[PDB]
Every structure is written in C-alpha cells, then in structure tokens.
Amino acid sequence: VLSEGEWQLVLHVWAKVEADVAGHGQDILIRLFKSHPETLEKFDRFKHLKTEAEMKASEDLKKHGVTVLTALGAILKKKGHHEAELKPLAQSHATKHKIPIKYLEFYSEAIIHVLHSRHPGDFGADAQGAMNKALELFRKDIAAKYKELGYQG
Ligand code: HEM
C-alpha cells in the first residue's frame, strides 16, 4: 500500500507529465523500444518504424502514447482504488495483445527513465521510490487480473 505522502509525490510528478502528455508518451515508447527491442514486435502498427526519427514523426505512435498515459494517469489518481480502470486494461493486455508482466516491468523502467530525464528536480530518490511503488502495485494487481482471465504471463 502506498502512504498518502507517496501518493502525493506520484501525483506531483504526474502533473508535470500532463504539461505535455504527447511528448512524454513518445519519449517513453521510444525508450522502451530502444532498451528492450523485443517489445516492438508486439505492436503490429509500429514495428515497421525503423529509426528514432521515424518514431518521433509518427502521428499514430504519438496518439497511442497519449491514450496509454491518459489511462495510466487515471489509474494513478485513484490511489490504489483502481479495479474499474484496471480491468479493461487487463482484459485487453492478457487476451488480445498478450503482454507478459516482464514487459510491463520494462515499460515501468521506461516511465521512470523519462520522468527522471525531464524532471530531475521533481523526481529525486523519494519521488522515484514512490512512483516505483505505484507502478509495482499496478503490476501486482494486473497480474492477479491476468490469472483470473486464465493468462499466466
Ligand atoms: C503501464 C503500462 C501500459 C499501459 C497503461 C497501457 C495502456 C494501453 C491502452 C490504454 C491501450 C488502448 C486500449 C487497449 O487496447 O487496452 C493499449 C493498447 C496496446 N498496448 Fe498497452 N499499455 C501498457 C503496456 C503495454 C506494453 C508493455 C505493451 C507491449 C510490450 C503494450 C502493448 C499494447 C498494444 C500492442 C496495444 C494495441 C495498440 C494499437 O495497435 O492500437 N502495452 N495499451
């Protein structure tokens, strides 16, 4: 469980994200594909993009990134009370996209890297600790939902 203080640190840095959701979304997706190239294989609509600049120029990748962060932001703002928001994401990610929890770990590492890169003064040790805990909670709870659906990834 996160404390109220941890939640507040999460939401404080999240507000910075919300100043430029698109740009954050692009940077996180790009970082994910650079750090863990196998994750790109899971995206039929993006895996033809061959360079960082093609990734940055893709409207579809940018639109997707905004969809992803909007969903994550809505989750985070529930401070752990996120069943209603998490369920549909679990459904799709288990049954259609087939995303293993290890790939969620990779995505979480990309989130932390971008936030630190763009907001180091508002993303020191305690903030990073808090966001890692929020993301860990998300991964824990999605995994349980995955299993309820019969998916063991
Ligand atoms: C914090 C982690 C993540 C969040 C919040 C998230 C969120 C979303 C949302 C909101 C959508 C659109 C609705 C849906 O299909 O459920 C989506 C689609 C998708 N997600 Fe994720 N996602 C996450 C992680 C991942 C990871 C790590 C991968 C792959 C390695 C992945 C692969 C996909 C794919 C392939 C789609 C369909 C994209 C399309 O063609 O339109 N997701 N995701």
How far is CA 98 from each of CA 72, 90, 132, rounded to the nearest angstrom? 18, 10, 23
Tell me, using a 6 A CB cutoff, whether residue 70 lines ligand 1: no
Nearest to 143, CA basis, from 109, 103, 112, 110: 103
3-state secondary structure of 143: helix
Q: Method of determination?
A: X-ray
Nearest to 64, CA basis, from 46, 82, 89: 46
Residue 117 alpha carbon to ligand 1 centre in Å: 23
User: Which ranges of 36-124 does DSSP label H, i.e. alpha helix?
Assistant: 52-57, 59-77, 83-92, 101-118
Q: How many residues does the chain have?
A: 153
For 52, what's the count of Cα atoms within 13 Å in the CB-facing half-sphere? 7
> Using CA atoms, how far apart are residues 55 and 31, in angstroms rounded to an integer?
11
How far is CA 20 from each of CA 29, 37, 138, rounded to the nearest angstrom? 15, 25, 23
Q: Among 58, 97, 146, which residue has the most ligand 1 atoms within 8 Å of its CB, making it the best to mutate?
A: 97
> 1-153: what CATH class?
mainly alpha
Tell me, using a 6 A CB cutoff, whether residue 130 lines ligand 1: no
Structure tokens at 28: 């996180």
Tell me, using a 6 A CB cutoff, whether residue 28 lines ligand 1: no
Q: What is the dihedral of CA 97, 98, 102, 107, to 10 degrees?
A: 10
Measured from the CA of 92, which atom of ligand 1 is nearest? Answer: 16
Residues contacting 147, CB < 8 A, separation 6+: none
Secondary structure (DSSP) of 9-55: HHHHHHHHHHTTHHHHHHHHHHHHHHH-GGGGGG-TTTTT--SHHHH
Gaps in the chain (C to N over 2.5 angstroms) fall after none
Helices 21-35 and 4-18 pack at an angle, to 10 degrees, of 100
This structure's resolution (Å) is: 1.6
Can you say whether the dihedral through the CA atoms of 29, 110, 153, 70 is positive or negative?
negative
> Using CA atoms, how far apart are residues 30 and 34, in angstroms rounded to an integer?
6
Measured from the CA of 43, which atom of ligand 1 is nearest? Answer: 35
Tell me, using a 6 A CB cutoff, whether residue 7 lines ligand 1: no
Annotated binding site: 64, 93
Tell me, using a 6 A CB cutoff, whether residue 99 lines ligand 1: yes
Structure tokens at 7: 């939640």
